[PDB]
Amino acid sequence: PDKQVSKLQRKNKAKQLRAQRILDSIENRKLFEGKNGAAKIITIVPLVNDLDPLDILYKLLKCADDEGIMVQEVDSKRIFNVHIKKFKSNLKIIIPDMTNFLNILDCAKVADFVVFGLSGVQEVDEEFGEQIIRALELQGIASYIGVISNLSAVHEKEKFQLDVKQSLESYFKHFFPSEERVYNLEKNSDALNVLRTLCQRLPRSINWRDNRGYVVADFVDFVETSPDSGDLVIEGTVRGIGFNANRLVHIPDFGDFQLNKIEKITVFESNMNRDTLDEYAPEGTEDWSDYDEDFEYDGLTTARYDDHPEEEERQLREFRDMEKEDREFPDEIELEPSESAIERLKRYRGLKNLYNCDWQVDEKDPSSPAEWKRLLRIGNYKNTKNRIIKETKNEAQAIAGDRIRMFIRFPKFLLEKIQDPKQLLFAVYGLLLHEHKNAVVNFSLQRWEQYDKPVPSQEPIVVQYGVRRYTIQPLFSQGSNSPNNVHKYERFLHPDTVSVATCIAPVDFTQSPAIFFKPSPTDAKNIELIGHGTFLNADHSRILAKRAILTGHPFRFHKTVVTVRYMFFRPEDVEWFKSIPLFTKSGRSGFIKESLGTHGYFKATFDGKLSAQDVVAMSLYKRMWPMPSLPWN
Amino acid sequence: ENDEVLLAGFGRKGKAKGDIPGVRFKVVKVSGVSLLALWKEKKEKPRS
Amino acid sequence: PRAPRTYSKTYSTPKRPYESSRLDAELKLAGEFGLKNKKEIYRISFQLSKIRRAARDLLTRDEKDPKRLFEGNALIRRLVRVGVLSEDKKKLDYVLALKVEDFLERRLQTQVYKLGLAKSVHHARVLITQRHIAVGKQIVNIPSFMVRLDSEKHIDFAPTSPFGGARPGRVARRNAARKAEASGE
RNA sequence: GAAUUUGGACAAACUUGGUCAUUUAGAGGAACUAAUUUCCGUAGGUGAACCUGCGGAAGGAUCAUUA
RNA sequence: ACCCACUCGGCACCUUACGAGAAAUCAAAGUCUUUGGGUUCUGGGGGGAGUAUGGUCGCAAGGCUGAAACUUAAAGGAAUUG
């Protein structure tokens, strides 16, 4: 009842809201502060072939005023557990190799800062360096700092030495314009601000990266407990949301694994509730989920309506030709008049409108994958992933910033690809509950900036969504919002407007960004990048419909309406395709009626007015089915 | 989702641009990268 | 902290922005007097607005009053020495009847054309901002100069800066040396 | 002439009660949204547009007869 | 008691339109852009709402006072016309 609640000076007592925020601001910064329980991760990437980025760390650690210049000798380590006295911070500085492009992309897929080298002398590489900036920039950067490091920033130019700073600031903004200036490392306090910013500025979170616990391995070793498999020993700092023993875990270029125990530096093993290295397989649980929909050959009338090296380059010229013509007359199959148009079009189903009609979700298909019932069905994906992240909070045994020796069930088959954790970056990413097992997913492709070559619809494309990377032959569709969730299949991909791919792959629960590429092993750096995109959701009900358009000409007008030239060939073509209506190019609708077919001609009926030297087109629709996918290592 | 947008109102002191039932603020800048310039393809947008 | 430097803007923007008379009538001024912006007209509207204000207040005062006689005669005399106002109209009732073509009559850009040897009124402006023309001992490179009617008998080409003498310049150097001398090898 | 020491004003501050307002995790609850004649005042009544009693207003459509 | 004339005060009609007004109409709603005789109260788009809350008076019914967040491009007055 009492509702004055006015005229108060204790408003100042709403400084307690300023103490809760400062309290959380300190409770953010327990993890990164101290000689104990702390590490930053920094990566130095030269965007030129030049520079040999050792010297970036040389210039950048002159301003420590310590004995951290004793490490960084000519002795090559590439990961440095450097503490700085002057800022009470401890850094894990990484330099990846310039050859392995995937080392670069999988480095900043762990990092917290990405210090970019630039050059005064040699321009930024268009085909390699720019691709580094774009690709890091689309997989997600925690934080990022620009650096000019040439002596010839002065030594070339006593010609008012700065002006290259406008070119590199100005160049450097065009990717990420949250950066005002590009720091010089050839003067003192400029380098100091770089060092400060590394030490004490917070890096932001990356949502998929921090909703999965992950370590950076400081020591790897293998323990035999089995004659082929065994146990690993991995020492590192937990930085993500954390770990539980009952999850799996993931390593890039090795795949998914199942860890055994976790040491804390209380030890937990993995009990009953741990998940396995399969899909939702079980080989008898399919036929408990029984289905109905049969499009048999019952009815020799009545299509389904429910009435109301140089040879591959010649293949490339074939793909450019088929996309070139498939632009101009899209979905228009060209019947051979010699061959009967019945056998070709047996499985097709004609529709008034895709958007309005309703399919029962599957059918007695048999061009589906038989593992269709071996797929995890999802309700509301939002009401899946917030629940799973909710269980990940409440059941994380490993708080971040804790040192862990990690015990992973691991084969002796795979020790021969392991390197030491100094010259490279064996780093281990956690997973979530159902992030191992297969369901029908959806991405959202868009083309790369330089890229203009055509992409067909089921050629294989490597997809890096989050950390894992699969080899995927996709299914493309334009983005639209039909209520039945039934969308038109694409045979090639658009010039610019963002489409949707679809395939079968195991699920992400974080909607990670994705880069799409094909491997280019003969070419330059090991990848010709195709596109970038974002994991939309896991929808099994995303029904793509293959559209095939049969096209005819009229001969003689004014009588009923119109006849047929090129549409059909036989009077067998009547009975299948003449309950199915028909469209034209700002015209009429429906119901061709029979005549001769002995030469070619089918005397059509319509609804409307205008007819001239024009075309006449009908349609038939068929579901496309997803293809299963494999990892890429 | 979970990005950093800068808001400003439409220009009516709140209510509408038009038919819109109860939406009053427009987004000016995502991730500090200025939707005008992205829409005109002058900068790029890094993720987070 | 030291005294604030005082400053004040000159032009005055028009109140109705798209007004079919004004948009067209200004542009005739832009044509004949060769001005780069409509702002260069607005500045003249503002100077005229201050003379019309200062004149308009003095007419509320009486004759034989020292403020009107003094400030009045200073106003008028200051406008006579710039040649905006003519000579017979020293009354102060007339200084309200001025208009923009009287100030724009006296820009140096047009004084060089009306004066002679600048053939156009655009060629005149280029002669100004390219350091050629002068007023006296002094060079002027700024068009909006308001030649003060005593200096009309002094406007000429500069002592330096050819058209005025002693040198040919840059382009005649490259021609007469690096083509005509280039015929010698 | 140091430590120390009695009383005094000046007094920060503490501990208990009661009391008020406010953030704060917060087990739960309660709900919450999206897949015709016109009146006024007043009293009573019916699932409901409503009906009835008393007083008031037109914000409502006066032709004839008076020699 | 009439009848006639005149006058003071009252209730009204009726007629002009001199002025007023958006108009219907008005001896005042006139003498207010040629914008000041004296004074009291009220309103400042429409809903939210005469509601919520607080006082306050009432045995009670209720009266007095009376917001805001919010939502909206109209809501309303006079008059003519098939």
Place this chain on the structure above:
RNA sequence: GCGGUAAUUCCAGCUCCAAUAGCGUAUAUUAAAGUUGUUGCAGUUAAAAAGCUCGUAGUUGAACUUUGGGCCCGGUUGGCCG
């Protein structure tokens, strides 16, 4: 408000305009606003005259009290007078 389809408003290409080293948007504020009213509003019917009267503070409050005539002195303006 334009576009259920021969788009003056959507998408581009030309062309044009306006401002010009500046231009555009949000928010506030002033003008516009005689929608704050002293100058200067409105209250029959559009929002608004309080149910009437008394009555204190407040605001405002009839007229009237040496007027005129002589008389020089006495500075300015204007002039044939120059």
Place this chain on the structure above:
RNA sequence: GGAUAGUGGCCUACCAUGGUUUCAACGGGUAACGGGGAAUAAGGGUUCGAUUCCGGAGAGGGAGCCUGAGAAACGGCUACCACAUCCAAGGAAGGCAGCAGGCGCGCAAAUUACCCAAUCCUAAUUCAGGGAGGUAGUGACAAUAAAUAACGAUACAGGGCCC
């Protein structure tokens, strides 16, 4: 009477019952330091003024005090509260709302630069000193002026029209 540098309920003792108010006390609020000013330009106003000058107040929060002519002084001290630093653990030490920097916060704000040469200030003092102040850096806060083209010939269409 005490106290004060000094009048004074400033404070003590005794005595009296007063003092302010709808000409709005008192209480509440202020995203309120006050002015000189600023913005808007018919007049009349309305809105703003943390911000270069004057005046006040504060130096994390309150309190107390030393020394001095002048401090309730914080680039002085003492205690308590709240924070927080080094520690060998016994103790020791501190307040950028000076300057430059950070960190948070935010829609929102630059250099850990050069110098006492001006301006003036301080001392026993022309000399020493001064992030008072100045100079440069950053700076599309705001202002002022104003480049991105001027002129010929030839030729086609003119509008004139030279006599």
Place this chain on the structure above:
RNA sequence: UAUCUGGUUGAUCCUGCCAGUAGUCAUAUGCUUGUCUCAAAGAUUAAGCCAUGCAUGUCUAAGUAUAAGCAAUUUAUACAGU
């Protein structure tokens, strides 16, 4: 430097607000950005916390120097210049 124009209707005249317009030494932001003169700049939220460096010292013929400091000793182991 004394100005309004679109929106309520079949069409009208109105009350009326909404929107448009211009200024802002009022801040923010977006896109651009060649010259000169000038110049604000952690006020708004958080009088929130601060690493380091620096911001307060001071001398003349003229208070006191046995520096076991320096210089020429040079007028003088009374001192006596700095």
